């Protein structure tokens, strides 16, 4: 067993019930004003758990840029910069189609590209 689950920093447990053995994962996430970046969840091995998700408080996250490469939707070639949590449709010049992509921290998931 592992033993006491850990915490976020800036966020809240999901479920964590003992007595923690090895292969057990916990849920983590941000509750209010956060964000959650990384993972959301933990894993007892070696005797610990794993690194955690970070909460962030959404305020230190950055600005994902819209990519002049990509073609976005109607509402969103007016956004040159995103802010996180933004599940947009990007496309590229010649997919007659969209990818659909979330901006996270200044990134987008998946990495729009174009190029």
Same mark, same amino acid.
């Given at each position: 067993?592992?033993?006491?689950?850990? #915490?976020?920093?800036?966020?809240?447990?999901?479920?964590?019930?003992?007595?923690?053995?090895?292969?057990?994962? +916990?849920? *983590?996430?941000?509750?209010?004003? *956060?964000?959650?970046?990384? &993972?959301?969840?933990?894993?007892?091995? &070696?005797?610990?758990?794993?690194?955690?998700?970070? !909460?962030?408080?959404?305020?230190?996250?950055?600005? !994902?840029?819209?990519?002049?490469?990509?073609?976005?939707?109607?509402?969103?070639?007016?956004?040159?910069? *995103?802010?996180?949590?933004?599940?947009?449709?990007?496309?590229?010049?010649?997919? #007659?189609?969209?990818?659909?992509?979330?901006?996270?921290?200044?990134?987008?998931?998946?990495? +729009?590209?174009?190029?």
């Amino acid at each position: 067993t592992c033993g006491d689950i850990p #915490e976020l920093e800036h966020g809240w447990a999901q479920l964590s019930s003992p007595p923690y053995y090895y292969g057990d994962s +916990v849920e *983590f996430n941000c509750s209010e004003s *956060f964000t959650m970046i990384g &993972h959301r969840s933990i894993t007892c091995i &070696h005797g610990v758990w794993t690194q955690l998700p970070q !909460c962030v408080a959404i305020d230190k996250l950055k600005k !994902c840029k819209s990519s002049n490469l990509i073609i976005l939707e109607e509402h969103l070639k007016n956004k040159k910069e *995103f802010d996180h949590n933004s599940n947009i449709r990007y496309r590229c010049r010649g997919k #007659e189609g969209w990818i659909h992509t979330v901006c996270i921290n200044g990134r987008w998931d998946p990495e +729009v590209n174009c190029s």
